[PDB]
Amino acid sequence: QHILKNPLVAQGIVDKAQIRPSDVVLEVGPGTGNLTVRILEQAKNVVAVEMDPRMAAELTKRVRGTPVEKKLEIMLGDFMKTELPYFDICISNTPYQISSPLVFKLINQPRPPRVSILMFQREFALRLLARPGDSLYCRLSANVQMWANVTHIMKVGKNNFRPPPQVESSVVRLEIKNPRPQVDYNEWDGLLRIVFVRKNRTISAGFKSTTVMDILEKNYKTFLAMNNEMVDDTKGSMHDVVKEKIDTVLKETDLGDKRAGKCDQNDFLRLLYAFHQVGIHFS
């Protein structure tokens, strides 16, 4: 629990959201409505999501007699367990332990938003906005940069906060691609989990572990048994075949030597296609 005391970063956060006069703002974790009332002026209908009924009672007390009294709903409970209604942009201050859930819940909405202005911890945001080859390019950046696009707005330094915390914060505009692209989710995530375990060792390193070859052997068997094509002779268990299979891909697409924390998104696509082409899937 911290309070954005600065009355001038609040206005800038709001008007960068480009609220149209026909929008449904979701506004997650409203606080004491230092920020909300601007959104009430600029949006047709606000849906604030809150967990502290003390704050909810005070916030709904704030709007009484005000002309905007009827354009605000409040949904209580845990944010990560509600059903959000349709909402059309999203503005968020919520305490940072939900910073990584929140993002993927917005990306995996049915009819996702169009723009969202989110507040994050500085190092978290700098994971999100890190291009291939930087020091901070992580697995999170490769996911989120596949399905969204993430752009810095400003630095919120730590002395605009009551009480002052220790970490610096950032304001970040996130905007979902539309249509979301037609690669799978679970195949994309399986591949990124494997190849980003050790970010700066080469890619063929990540396909040496014996947990991983067990996983891929199991998947390849279950794929053949999905198509009912009975199995040949393997010198160990089936991974034998898989082993040379993997090596062959890492010969052709050349990627078995580049280091996964320097390979941008088209390279992961080419690797995903090459494993799909020879009968490997990741979930």
Partner: peptide, 15 residues
């Protein structure tokens, strides 16, 4: 961007 789009079509092939 062009390269990306052609490969995503070829991945539609092997779903």
């Amino acid at each position: 961007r062009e390269e990306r789009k052609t490969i995503i079509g070829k991945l539609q092939d092997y779903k």
